[PDB]
Swiss-Prot record, chain A:
Keywords attached to this entry: Cytoplasm, Isopeptide bond, Ribonucleoprotein, Ribosomal protein, Ubl conjugation
Gene that this sequence comes from: RPL29
Miscellaneous comment: Present with 51100 molecules/cell in log phase SD medium.
Name the UniProt record assigns to this protein: Large ribosomal subunit protein eL29
Matches recorded under Pfam families: Ribosomal_L29e
Organism: Saccharomyces cerevisiae (strain ATCC 204508 / S288c) (Baker's yeast)
Transmembrane domains' residue ranges: none
Known role: Component of the ribosome, a large ribonucleoprotein complex responsible for the synthesis of proteins in the cell. The small ribosomal subunit (SSU) binds messenger RNAs (mRNAs) and translates the encoded message by selecting cognate aminoacyl-transfer RNA (tRNA) molecules. The large subunit (LSU) contains the ribosomal catalytic site termed the peptidyl transferase center (PTC), which catalyzes the formation of peptide bonds, thereby polymerizing the amino acids delivered by tRNAs into a polypeptide chain.
Region annotation (Disordered) ranges: 1-36
Main localisation: cytoplasm
From Swiss-Prot, chain B:
One GO MF term: structural constituent of ribosome
Classification lineage: Eukaryota, Fungi, Dikarya, Ascomycota, Saccharomycotina
Annotated function: Component of the ribosome, a large ribonucleoprotein complex responsible for the synthesis of proteins in the cell. The small ribosomal subunit (SSU) binds messenger RNAs (mRNAs) and translates the encoded message by selecting cognate aminoacyl-transfer RNA (tRNA) molecules. The large subunit (LSU) contains the ribosomal catalytic site termed the peptidyl transferase center (PTC), which catalyzes the formation of peptide bonds, thereby polymerizing the amino acids delivered by tRNAs into a polypeptide chain.
Descriptive protein name: Large ribosomal subunit protein eL18A
Cross-link (Glycyl lysine isopeptide (Lys-Gly) (interchain with G-Cter in ubiquitin)), chain numbering: K115
Gene that this sequence comes from: RPL18A
Organism: Saccharomyces cerevisiae (strain ATCC 204508 / S288c)
Swiss-Prot record, chain C:
Entry remark concerning the domains of this protein: The eukaryote-specific C-terminal extension harbors a nuclear import signal and delivers the ACL4-uL4/RPL4 complex to the pre-ribosome, triggering uL4 release from ACL4 and incorporation into the 60S ribosomal subunit.
Organism lineage: Eukaryota, Fungi, Dikarya, Ascomycota, Saccharomycotina
Residue numbers of the full-length protein present here: 312 to 362 of 362
Protein's organism: Saccharomyces cerevisiae (strain ATCC 204508 / S288c) (Baker's yeast)
Protein name: Large ribosomal subunit protein uL4A
Effect on the protein of changing F23A: Leads to an inefficient release from ACL4 with a delayed assembly into the 60S subunit
Outcome after substituting K4A: Significantly diminished nuclear localization
UniProtKB/Swiss-Prot annotation, chain D:
This protein's encoding gene: RPL7A
A biological process from GO: cytoplasmic translation
Name of the protein described by the UniProt record: Large ribosomal subunit protein uL30A
PROSITE patterns cross-referenced by the UniProt entry: RIBOSOMAL_L30
UniProt keyword terms in alphabetical order: Cytoplasm, Ribonucleoprotein, Ribosomal protein
Entry's Gene Ontology molecular function annotations: RNA binding; structural constituent of ribosome
Source organism: Saccharomyces cerevisiae (strain ATCC 204508 / S288c) (Baker's yeast)
Similarity annotation: Belongs to the universal ribosomal protein uL30 family.
Any Gene Ontology CC annotation: cytoplasm
Additional notes on this entry: Present with 101000 molecules/cell in log phase SD medium. There are 2 genes for uL30 in yeast.
Biological role stated in the UniProt entry: Component of the ribosome, a large ribonucleoprotein complex responsible for the synthesis of proteins in the cell. The small ribosomal subunit (SSU) binds messenger RNAs (mRNAs) and translates the encoded message by selecting cognate aminoacyl-transfer RNA (tRNA) molecules. The large subunit (LSU) contains the ribosomal catalytic site termed the peptidyl transferase center (PTC), which catalyzes the formation of peptide bonds, thereby polymerizing the amino acids delivered by tRNAs into a polypeptide chain.
Chain segments annotated as coiled-coil in the UniProt record: none
Keyword Membrane: no
Bridged cysteine pairs (disulfide): none
Length: 58, 185, 51, 222, 171, 159
RNA sequence: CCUGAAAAUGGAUGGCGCUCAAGCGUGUUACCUAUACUCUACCGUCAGGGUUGAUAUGAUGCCCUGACGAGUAGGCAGGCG
RNA sequence: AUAUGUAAGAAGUCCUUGUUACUUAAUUGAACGUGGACAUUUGAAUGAAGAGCUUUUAGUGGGCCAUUUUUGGUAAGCAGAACUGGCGAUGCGGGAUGAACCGAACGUAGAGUUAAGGUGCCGGAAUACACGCUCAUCAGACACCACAAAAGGUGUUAGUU
RNA sequence: AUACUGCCAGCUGGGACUGAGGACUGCGACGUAAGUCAAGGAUGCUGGCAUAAUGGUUAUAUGCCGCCCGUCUUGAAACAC
């Protein structure tokens, strides 16, 4: 009692019903996976930038 | 025949004529439909759809949240409009002299408003005293801070509060949740 | 309530266009042209009739 | 406020002025068409007299009519037909000729009949079957007031201005064509002239680029 | 339908390196202008390194016969494809026009060899009027002197289904 | 049994080249990639560390991370009915900048130049690109170019 | 076109029948008709809207406009008993 | 060749480097940012029937058949893959008859026009018009398709030397 | 002049189906102005019966069409249940 093993029939149609729309993009992407040295530096630089901006517009 | 691109006879996907059988809610909906139709005020339109909104989509807004909205710069004298229930917060010890328009007020919240000196008014009084929503500020409660939403979207590597009944040791804290027991999620 | 098609119902045609009126008045659908005898090239006729 | 005498007089004066300016514009358009045609003819004659050949400028506008049904059509031609608004059989649309649109037409060759329409057939199509796309609704044009209200930002204030833009494709041809709802033509009154439609017009069929015969085909279908 | 004689002249697209290309001309029998341009491009592709995208057609003019009301013999050199191979042949036909001549040529090709317009190329069509030059008996038999013949067994077409006397085939 | 390895069916794809074997020229190491740069992936068969997968061979992505000898590239890969964002740690030998992005940046600079020129005098710059328009009318001469008539050639064996 | 070319109940270019065909190859061109296309009426669905002038229409009321309509497994809605 | 990855800008382009514990020999770079300049061609075409997003759940998890690519097999209405379109789930007109072929998809009616297929009669529509070819003491007659070959015949017709 | 092709907001004729719809309205046309129109959907005139005449129901007859339902199934009218 053998049966059909595999097929890609109807798969593209099923995908394209409500499918291949592009993923949504963001400003300020996640900083995970980037160099942790750069992460520490960016954290300190952002803190300093916020402090300086508050000082500039008190 | 027509080679259709969109789905035929597709409903709006939004809410109108709210499921509540409250005759008074129907009266408010009628008044604000008239206001939105004959006024062109975006405040009127948004208040109409907020009236259409359901319960979990109308979270309670606390007097502390209203106080924060008033502490916003240039918003001390704005009529705070919430479409829902205003609850009393015991974590604040001061209230300003604002006017609050809302569907429902808890006893403690209404007492807080009138003791601070402001007035609790309904949406019909808000309409009669501000047909275009002049000098109004709409408040909304946190919709995504409930048990259901914390359970929603559960899966591997999401961290979304697994649907459980008993919480503690030996209740889903094992193989599949720590490296010492098989894998970690 | 009912669509009235131009190219018939001259009333609707004139409602959409008064140049229909002046076009009919001046008979611009059958308009003559001034004749000028610009003769072609012998090389042109020879190329056309070439075997 | 009677709104019987003064309002009516002001509205009628505005309408009369608009009609006068529409008439002036239509006269200018007719003069331009006649001048262009006669200039083409004299250019050909001048080339012949000077011994040179006058090559006709490639036509800037085509009319394309989907003539195949909605069944058993591959995805890329189906999507191109949808993009050209050919979602039904015997359904027509005006197309500006560019490389992109020519590639689209080459893609959908076996399902459409397209060609180069003239002012006569363009006017026939617009007058007989003219429907605007207003609030996503197919309302008949039927009024220079409607056309002006929906295209007055581009200066198109009448069916004559719309037709002029279509025939002499201009800056706002895209907007005018998109305002024009796709034409729903009937089957040809005298038949298709061929025993079998789904061969190329060159091969004795009906689909493909019938360059100047689209005028006769669309006048029979309209 | 009935063929029409066209002269189609076109060139390659003029580039900066070589302006004013060679302006090749062809005489072709086609149903109308669209098929005329199609056949011109097909033959110019068969002969020269150029396609429709890389070239343009500078002129296409219909050619009417100089005298369409006098009988002249026509020698047609054609090449055609059969189910097996390609063959060149030469036919002679008596006709009043070149367009009608290629009409009968295509009809006779389809009748006698099942060759279609797809498979038939007309290499050359030459008008002639000299006797002892035509090589086909089925033309010389009509070019014989003082040619007169009857039409035996005349059949008269009837409009009604019933006729009330036996027909006569006299003439 | 079927075989689906990491480098399965990558024979010719990761085949190095013809007469381009051996060491790699140092321009590739000298190129500089910053975060946000669009880069093309073409795996080098002679370098075995940092090699991309055969799926990402020939794809284009955005640099999101920079490291000692590598670069983090983001590629949208179609998985089922959606694209997922895959992050690769590729090496500078396998990675290469995008001439398309360079051309677009050059066009942006040019476009700004023409807009500045328009602000100077306003000569209807028409910033946008237009497709291949149909060719207008032209007059072609026959002097020195009399048309040479062509005819179909008879069939011949030519063997 | 013919010879190659032989299977079992009686038998199938669908049948009758057809021979300058009602056969074959190719061309005009007229004509027939699908629940398809065009227009019109009506039904329903969907969408977009208008309406607080009488002391008459639960504004779930009235009205305008346009598009759409196949359906097993299945889902939901509105109704009958 | 067909398929296939990107880009075609405002989350953008140019002067102030303001912050940094990163980096540089170095106020050198890197990242982020404050101040300023850029409108109806905000940087190709076409379309968009409203973008986007979340929850929850049914049935399904035996498939089969065209046209192309293609594997095993002599082959199979055989077995197995790729893309697409269909049948399943679908009537309707045509192929006489048929799940898949050709047209075309379907609310209830009317008129007109056609598609595919046809017009001798069955059967609605030319025993049309035009050119040829064929005479079979097993003619031939319209795809999928319901079969025929090598070889041969001054039967007849048309074609270099 | 004339096979031809294209255009006419050119001129006449013969047929057919349809007649949807509202308490002031709109867009227009027509002699130097009264107002009328084919201009946001049919009216005018005239006949026959003041009834099974038209129709509804029903039974035959006639033309064409129509396989026995439910189920399993890729496939059922099935010589499958």
């Amino acid at each position: 009692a053998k049966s059909k093993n595999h097929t890609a029939h109807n798969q593209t149609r099923k995908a394209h019903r409500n499918g291949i729309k592009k993923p949504k993009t963001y400003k300020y992407p996640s900083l995970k996976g980037v160099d942790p040295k750069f992460r520490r530096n960016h954290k300190h630089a952002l803190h300093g930038t916020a402090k300086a901006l508050a000082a500039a517009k008190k | 025949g027509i080679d259709h691109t969109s789905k035929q006879h597709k409903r709006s996907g939004h809410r109108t004529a709210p499921k509540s059988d409250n005759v008074y809610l129907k009266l408010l909906v009628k008044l604000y439909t008239f206001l939105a139709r004959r006024t062109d005020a975006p405040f009127n339109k948004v208040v109409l759809k907020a009236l259409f909104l359901s319960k979990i989509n109308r979270p309670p807004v606390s007097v502390s949240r209203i106080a924060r909205a008033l502490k916003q710069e240039g918003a001390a004298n704005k009529t705070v409009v919430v479409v829902g229930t205003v609850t009393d917060d015991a974590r604040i010890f001061e209230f300003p002299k604002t006017t609050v328009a809302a569907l429902r007020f808890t006893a403690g919240a209404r007492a807080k408003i009138v003791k601070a000196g402001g007035e609790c008014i309904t949406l019909d009084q808000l309409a009669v005293r501000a047909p275009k929503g002049q000098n109004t500020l709409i408040l909304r409660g946190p919709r995504n801070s409930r048990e259901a939403v914390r359970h929603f979207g559960m899966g591997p590597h999401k961290g979304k509060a697994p649907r459980i009944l008993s919480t503690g040791r030996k209740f889903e804290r094992a193989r599949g949740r720590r490296r010492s027991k098989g894998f970690k999620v | 309530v009912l669509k009235k098609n131009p190219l018939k119902n001259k009333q609707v045609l004139l409602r959409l266009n008064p140049y229909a009126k002046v076009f009919a008045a001046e008979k611009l659908g059958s308009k003559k042209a001034e004749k000028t005898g610009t003769k072609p090239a012998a090389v042109f006729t020879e190329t056309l009739k070439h075997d | 406020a009677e709104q019987v005498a003064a309002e009516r007089a002001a509205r009628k004066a505005a309408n009369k002025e608009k009609r006068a300016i529409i008439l002036e514009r239509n006269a200018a358009y007719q003069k331009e068409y006649e001048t262009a045609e006669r200039n083409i003819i004299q250019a050909k004659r001048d080339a012949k007299a000077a011994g040179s050949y006058y090559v006709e400028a490639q036509h800037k506008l085509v009319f394309v009519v989907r003539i195949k049904g909605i069944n058993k059509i591959p995805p890329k031609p189906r999507k191109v037909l949808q993009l050209l608004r050919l979602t039904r059989i015997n359904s027509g649309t005006f197309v500006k000729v560019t490389k992109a649109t020519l590639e689209l037409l080459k893609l959908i060759e076996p399902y459409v009949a397209y060609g180069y329409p003239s002012y006569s057939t363009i006017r026939q199509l617009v007058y007989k079957r003219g429907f605007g796309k207003i609030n996503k609704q197919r309302v008949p044009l039927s009024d220079n007031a409607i056309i002006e209200a929906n295209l007055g930002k581009y200066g198109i204030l009448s069916i004559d201005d719309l037709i002029h833009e279509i025939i002499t494709v201009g800056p706002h041809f895209k907007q005018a064509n998109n305002f024009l709802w796709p034409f729903k033509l009937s089957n040809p009154s005298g038949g298709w002239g061929v025993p079998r439609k789904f061969k190329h017009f060159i091969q004795g069929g009906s689909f493909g680029n019938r360059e100047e015969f689209i005028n006769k085909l669309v006048k029979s279908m309209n | 339908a009935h063929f029409k004689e066209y002269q189609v002249i076109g060139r390659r697209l003029p580039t900066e390196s070589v302006p004013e290309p060679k302006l090749f001309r062809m005489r072709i029998f086609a149903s109308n202008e669209v098929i005329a341009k199609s056949r011109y491009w097909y033959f110019l592709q068969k002969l020269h390194k150029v396609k429709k995208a890389s070239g343009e057609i500078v002129s296409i003019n219909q050619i009417n016969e100089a005298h369409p009301t006098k009988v002249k013999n026509f020698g047609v050199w054609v090449r055609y494809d059969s189910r097996s191979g390609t063959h060149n042949m030469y036919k002679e036909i008596r006709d009043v026009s070149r367009v009608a001549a290629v009409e009968t040529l295509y009809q006779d090709m389809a009748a006698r060899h099942r060759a279609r317009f797809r498979s038939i190329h007309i290499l050359k069509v030459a008008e002639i009027e000299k006797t002892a030059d035509v090589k086909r008996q089925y033309v010389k038999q009509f070019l014989t002197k003082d040619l007169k013949f009857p039409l035996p067994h005349r059949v008269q077409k009837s409009t009604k289904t019933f006729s009330y006397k036996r027909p006569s085939t006299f003439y | 049994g079927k075989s689906h390895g990491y480098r399965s069916r990558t024979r010719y794809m990761f085949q190095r080249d013809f007469r381009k074997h051996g060491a790699v020229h140092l321009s590739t190491y000298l190129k500089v990639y910053k975060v946000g740069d669009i880069v093309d992936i073409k795996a080098n068969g002679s370098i075995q560390k940092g090699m991309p997968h055969k799926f990402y061979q020939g794809k284009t992505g955005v640099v999101y991370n920079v490291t000692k000898s590598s670069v983090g590239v983001i590629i949208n890969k179609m998985v089922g009915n959606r694209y997922l964002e895959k992050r690769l740690n590729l090496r500078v030998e396998h990675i290469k900048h995008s001439k398309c992005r360079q051309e677009f940046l050059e066009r942006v600079k040019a476009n700004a130049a023409k807009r500045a020129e328009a602000k100077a005098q306003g000569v209807a710059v028409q910033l946008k690109r237009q497709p291949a328009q149909p060719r207008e009318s032209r007059i072609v001469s026959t002097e020195g170019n009399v048309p040479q008539t062509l005819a179909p050639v008879p069939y011949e064996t030519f063997i």
